[PDB]
Amino acid sequence: PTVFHKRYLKKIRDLGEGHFGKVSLYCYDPTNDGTGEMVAVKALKADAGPQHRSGWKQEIDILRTLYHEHIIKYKGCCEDAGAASLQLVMEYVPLGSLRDYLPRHSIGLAQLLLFAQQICEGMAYLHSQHYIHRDLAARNVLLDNDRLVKIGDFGLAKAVPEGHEYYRVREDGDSPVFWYAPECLKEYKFYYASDVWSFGVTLYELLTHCDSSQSPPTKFLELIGIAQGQMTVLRLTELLERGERLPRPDKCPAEVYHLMKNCWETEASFRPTFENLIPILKTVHEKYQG
Ligand SMILES: COc1ccc(OC)c(Sc2ccc3nnc(-c4cnn(C)c4)n3n2)c1
């Protein structure tokens, strides 16, 4: 609803960038003095196609209506005359993503489980608003402070139709396949349970402290190999069908690993929902906190 004026926007640094999306840090200072607020601005590349342009408007509209303690705060929008679209203005989460934070800061198991609990609370809220995230990964989880985490990029987020239990995707080259459930890779159908599979992968990332050598693409590519022509996805689909999974991270308790494996049930309906996960993680965090 809010309109940011381009004349008070001052670019500080780039924060992240993909194939069609880009996030940069700006100071919004309508006094040219001190009081200036720090904002994260997402822009769509002017070269993006009509599917990405219509999907960009869908993204702004999803975030314009979402409001939760564990979801990034929508600030407003400013015109991007340079791209003939809009720029998405969000609050700046200063400690950044868990992907950049965890390899640099030794975080105890207790705090990691609190983050996992917070991720599920934000995801359950998203699912109650009938939206699927489709890109749940540690790179998309933002650290506000030592005890606050927020879900941050809604670039693939979709509305689940009223009469359906899933959304049909039709796969692209930018799909985060190493965080995807077998039904996504094989049938191109994204269920609410498909986001729970991705959370399982996120939970694995958190427990490995986002170590690159232990990351899902590294680990799965060690199992598949790199001389597979166009068949990486097919080889991943069959290893998952054989019941092969990411290993137990060093120092991850057995029960937390069992919960991870429960999120990785081949059969989507055998997975817990985010609402089911919230009291389980509440109790597992209470345990390890003491
Ligand atoms: C185009 O790509 C992205 C990628 C990741 C995102 O969330 C992780 C977002 S929304 C968003 C909102 C507030 C915020 N404060 N910092 C960051 C931030 C830091 N690193 N990165 C990559 C984003 N954000 N990001 C958009």
Side-chain angles (χ1 to χ4, degrees), residues 15-16 21-23 40 42 72 90-91 93 139-140 142 152-153:
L15 292 172
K22 152 104 98 69
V23 167
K42 192 168 174 187
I72 45 157
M90 295 156 289
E91 62 147 11
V93 193
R139 66 183 159 276
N140 288 327
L142 294 161
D153 174 0

Side-chain angles (χ1 to χ4, degrees), residues 17-50:
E17 56 183 305
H19 246 280
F20 312 99
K22 152 104 98 69
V23 167
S24 304
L25 171 62
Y26 285 79
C27 178
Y28 190 67
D29 201 1
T31 327
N32 213 326
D33 73 342
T35 68
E37 198 65 39
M38 298 224 281
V39 291
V41 184
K42 192 168 174 187
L44 186 92
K45 296 171 162 73
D47 45 75

Side-chain angles (χ1 to χ4, degrees), residues 86-116:
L86 297 154
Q87 262 161 308
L88 184 48
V89 200
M90 295 156 289
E91 62 147 11
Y92 173 55
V93 193
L95 304 184
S97 80
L98 287 178
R99 199 223 194 220
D100 305 329
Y101 189 84
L102 297 183
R104 296 149 176 96
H105 305 81
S106 56
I107 297 296
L109 174 65
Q111 294 166 68
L112 297 175
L113 292 169
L114 170 68
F115 300 164

Side-chain angles (χ1 to χ4, degrees), residues 47-253:
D47 45 75
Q51 188 43 251
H52 290 288
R53 281 180 169 266
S54 77
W56 175 235
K57 289 174 181 177
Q58 280 167 242
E59 185 187 340
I60 287 164
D61 284 6
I62 292 177
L63 207 50
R64 249 169 77 102
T65 61
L66 291 175
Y67 216 72
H68 200 261
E69 60 176 339
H70 299 303
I71 295 293
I72 45 157
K73 252 165 212 278
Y74 176 88
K75 241 65 195 63
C77 260
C78 67
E79 287 204 295
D80 197 345
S85 52
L86 297 154
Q87 262 161 308
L88 184 48
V89 200
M90 295 156 289
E91 62 147 11
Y92 173 55
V93 193
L95 304 184
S97 80
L98 287 178
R99 199 223 194 220
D100 305 329
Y101 189 84
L102 297 183
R104 296 149 176 96
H105 305 81
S106 56
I107 297 296
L109 174 65
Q111 294 166 68
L112 297 175
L113 292 169
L114 170 68
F115 300 164
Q117 193 200 129
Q118 294 178 351
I119 293 155
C120 290
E121 296 174 349
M123 290 301 295
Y125 163 76
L126 189 66
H127 282 192
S128 73
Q129 298 297 100
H130 304 80
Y131 296 113
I132 51 178
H133 190 277
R134 299 180 60 224
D135 197 18
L136 185 50
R139 66 183 159 276
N140 288 327
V141 183
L142 294 161
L143 216 228
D144 198 288
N145 56 67
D146 40 52
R147 265 80 190 171
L148 225 168
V149 113
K150 281 159 189 222
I151 298 152
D153 174 0
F154 291 82
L156 296 184
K158 290 288 171 192
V160 189
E162 281 85 335
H164 301 293
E165 5 122 55
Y166 61 91
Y167 163 86
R168 288 187 251 245
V169 304
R170 165 77 168 86
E171 218 183 301
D172 280 22
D174 71 337
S175 303
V177 296
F178 297 111
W179 281 251
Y180 277 5
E183 67 271 9
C184 308
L185 303 169
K186 220 174 174 68
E187 296 179 290
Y188 313 96
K189 292 171 166 78
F190 204 102
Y191 297 79
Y192 288 112
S194 305
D195 272 331
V196 163
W197 174 289
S198 306
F199 164 76
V201 187
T202 298
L203 184 57
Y204 165 88
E205 295 190 81
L206 266 50
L207 268 300
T208 59
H209 308 267
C210 289
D211 175 14
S212 260
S213 76
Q214 301 300 305
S215 77
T218 302
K219 296 265 122 178
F220 284 124
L221 279 167
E222 282 162 6
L223 296 160
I224 291 156
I226 59 159
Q228 298 316 301
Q230 298 167 258
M231 316 176 310
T232 298
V233 170
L234 259 127
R235 280 277 172 205
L236 172 61
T237 303
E238 56 196 40
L239 81 90
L240 295 174
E241 289 175 326
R242 284 196 308 276
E244 299 188 37
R245 292 300 180 267
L246 291 165
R248 186 177 142 184
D250 185 64
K251 293 181 271 80
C252 165

